[PDB]
Amino acid sequence: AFVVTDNCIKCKYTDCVEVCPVDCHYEGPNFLVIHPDECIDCALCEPECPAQAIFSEDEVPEDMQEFIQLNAELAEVWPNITEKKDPLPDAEDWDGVKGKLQHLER
Template sequence: MTFVIALHCVDVKDRACIDECPLDCIYEGERMLYIQPDECIDCGACEPVCPVEAIFCEDDIPQEWQHFTTVNAEFFSDLGTPGSSAKLGPIGRDHPIVAALPSQDAVA
């Protein structure tokens, strides 16, 4: 089990979760943040600090956002397990599903 960042993070990227994560397993894409599932220890520290409630335990993610479990995992397909978002820094891309989404600023 791991935590997953879903739709509400797109175009927000508050980063409070990054500050709270004891393992630096939350990475920054262009439009949203992603949790590296192999690095996450399921501590849950990130979930309560998210101001838009975009972080879910994978067992509790709403049905309409279930695909974000795959989105988070696939984001790391070419990165593997970098070991620290602080060392790697922002990643200049997003998962194709996220990149294709309309601006969430316009949706709000």
């Protein structure tokens, strides 16, 4: 499965949903996750993320391992998103800021 990590929070460009062939993304107020069981590992969404926040599970940085289980957990309770939307209001301000997990909204 592929996993959405920290830099997506407060950015949520959603440029990753249009190329997904199986619509396995689920959205929160300021973050998006990939459902591990529905994801077919096509890797097509990874280069589409301006925040470079997507990684295949085996490539998730050591300091962001928590996002693997987090994607699995939130994909179970959040609504499905299959269409591209406008990025969050101040996405550019937050793109690159570290430790944004502290700002994650349920």
